[PDB]
Design an enzyme around this catalytic site. Structure first.
Site, mmCIF file in Angstrom:
data_model
loop_
_atom_site.group_PDB
_atom_site.id
_atom_site.type_symbol
_atom_site.label_atom_id
_atom_site.label_comp_id
_atom_site.label_asym_id
_atom_site.label_seq_id
_atom_site.Cartn_x
_atom_site.Cartn_y
_atom_site.Cartn_z
ATOM 1 N N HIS A 61 -30.220 16.493 -21.984
ATOM 2 C CA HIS A 61 -31.348 15.272 -21.266
ATOM 3 C C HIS A 61 -30.164 14.627 -20.015
ATOM 4 C CE1 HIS A 61 -30.494 12.453 -24.312
ATOM 5 N NE2 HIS A 61 -30.045 11.762 -23.346
ATOM 6 N N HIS A 91 -24.146 7.868 -16.844
ATOM 7 C CA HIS A 91 -24.948 9.034 -16.545
ATOM 8 C C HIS A 91 -25.754 8.933 -15.676
ATOM 9 C CE1 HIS A 91 -27.561 6.509 -19.236
ATOM 10 N NE2 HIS A 91 -28.322 6.935 -18.263
ATOM 11 N N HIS A 93 -29.424 10.152 -13.536
ATOM 12 C CA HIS A 93 -30.903 10.830 -13.526
ATOM 13 C C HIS A 93 -31.090 11.421 -12.070
ATOM 14 C CE1 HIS A 93 -32.027 8.436 -17.150
ATOM 15 N NE2 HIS A 93 -31.178 7.814 -16.741
ATOM 16 N N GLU A 103 -34.747 6.372 -11.069
ATOM 17 C CA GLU A 103 -35.753 5.604 -12.105
ATOM 18 C C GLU A 103 -36.545 4.444 -11.599
ATOM 19 O OE1 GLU A 103 -33.712 5.966 -15.648
ATOM 20 O OE2 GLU A 103 -35.320 7.638 -15.900
ATOM 21 N N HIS A 116 -26.274 5.169 -13.963
ATOM 22 C CA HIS A 116 -26.331 3.841 -15.058
ATOM 23 C C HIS A 116 -25.091 3.757 -15.839
ATOM 24 C CE1 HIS A 116 -31.129 4.424 -15.371
ATOM 25 N NE2 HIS A 116 -30.730 3.846 -14.366
ATOM 26 N N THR A 195 -34.121 3.803 -20.387
ATOM 27 C CA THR A 195 -35.461 4.600 -19.920
ATOM 28 C C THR A 195 -35.812 6.073 -20.628
ATOM 29 O OG1 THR A 195 -33.970 5.458 -18.453
ATOM 30 C CG2 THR A 195 -34.884 3.380 -17.750
HETATM 31 O O1 TH0 Z 1 -27.717 4.168 -23.968
HETATM 32 C C1 TH0 Z 1 -28.421 4.604 -22.996
HETATM 33 C C2 TH0 Z 1 -28.765 6.026 -22.719
HETATM 34 C C3 TH0 Z 1 -29.787 6.144 -21.666
HETATM 35 C C4 TH0 Z 1 -30.034 5.116 -20.997
HETATM 36 S S1 TH0 Z 1 -31.164 5.012 -19.363
HETATM 37 C C5 TH0 Z 1 -29.671 3.849 -21.068
HETATM 38 O O2 TH0 Z 1 -29.996 2.956 -19.971
HETATM 39 C C6 TH0 Z 1 -28.737 3.460 -22.188
HETATM 40 ZN ZN ZN Z 2 -30.245 6.173 -17.777
#
Ligand code: TH0
Ligand code: ZN
Ligand code: S24
EC number: 4.2.1.1
Length: 257
Positions: A61, A91, A93, A103, A116, A195
């Site tokens: 994902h 990571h 998005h 987001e 993030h 999220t």
């Molecule tokens: O540990 C995390 C996984 C995904 C996301 S969007 C986070 O904000 C923390």
């Molecule tokens: Zn995230």
């Protein structure tokens, strides 16, 4: 299981994760005219000089860059936080088109992607304990807009080839996350949640005002990744963002006037 398509995407998550309709869900739209400037807020302190990156992963994902968090090497302090938060992973998005992908939104403006940087409060001893606490995580959110290339991002984009499908990982040592920060650390902050499922309400969000610019070719490589595992029908990894959630009984605070 959950994902971002029509049959398993965010509007369906609440059936397996009922906290999806919770009171402190993320992301949210940041209305810059109703956020409250708070002189009580301290500058952020980012100490990433001793970061130890380990690995980059495609988890089906997003892709995660993972860090050694067994000691206080790369930490976040100050701002609205109490105590020391260790970096464990970052990571992104992103969107299928440059006009969407972030987001959080700012006055309903969408950016092409959002970074993030996930940190956990050392007081709870490990990440697993921290996500069960209302002050367990601190996540630095940084917007990406399309423009000039970001030199510090290219080492990431060059390795994506090697983790194209779900479950693939690669060694990713000596990466310096300082090359992903904007010049200014002014921010907005509000209490919110992961999220992605399990959507736990354990996050202090710190969203930076200033975006970083990346080139079109850099984010194009993001869009070549796959949600599927090797040997499955190919589904491109795009639009792995959750829409804005009702802010309800919170006030977004700003570190700047
Ligand atoms: O540990 C995390 C996984 C995904 C996301 S969007 C986070 O904000 C923390
Ligand atoms: Zn995230
Ligand atoms: O990034 C991850 O999510 S993987 C990981 C798991 C545990 C740990 O202590 C450190 C990590 O980097």
């Amino acid at each position: 299981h959950w994902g971002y398509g029509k049959h398993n995407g965010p509007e369906h998550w609440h059936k397996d994760f009922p906290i999806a309709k919770g009171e402190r869900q993320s992301p949210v739209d940041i209305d810059t005219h109703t956020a409250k400037y708070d002189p009580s807020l301290k500058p952020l302190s980012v100490s990433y000089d001793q970061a130890t990156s380990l690995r980059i992963l495609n988890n089906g994902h997003a892709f995660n860059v993972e860090f050694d968090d067994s000691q206080d090497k790369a930490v976040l302090k100050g701002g609205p936080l109490d105590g020391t938060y260790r970096l464990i992973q970052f990571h992104f998005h992103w969107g299928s088109l440059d006009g969407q992908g972030s987001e959080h939104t700012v006055d309903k403006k969408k950016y092409a992607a959002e970074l993030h940087l996930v940190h956990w409060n050392t007081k709870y001893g490990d990440f697993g304990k921290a996500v069960q606490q209302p002050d367990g995580l601190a996540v630095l959110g940084i917007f990406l807009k399309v423009g000039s290339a970001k030199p510090g991002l290219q080492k990431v984009v060059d390795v994506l080839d090697s983790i194209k499908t779900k479950g693939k990982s690669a060694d990713f040592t000596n990466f310096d996350p300082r090359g992903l920060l904007p010049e200014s650390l002014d921010y907005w902050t509000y209490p919110g949640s992961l999220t992605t499922p399990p959507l736990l309400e354990c996050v202090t969000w710190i969203v930076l005002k200033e975006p970083i610019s990346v080139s079109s070719e850099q984010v194009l490589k993001f869009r070549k990744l796959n949600f599927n595992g090797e040997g499955e029908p190919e589904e491109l990894m795009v639009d792995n963002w959750r829409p804005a959630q009702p802010l309800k009984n919170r006030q977004i605070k700003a570190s700047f006037k």
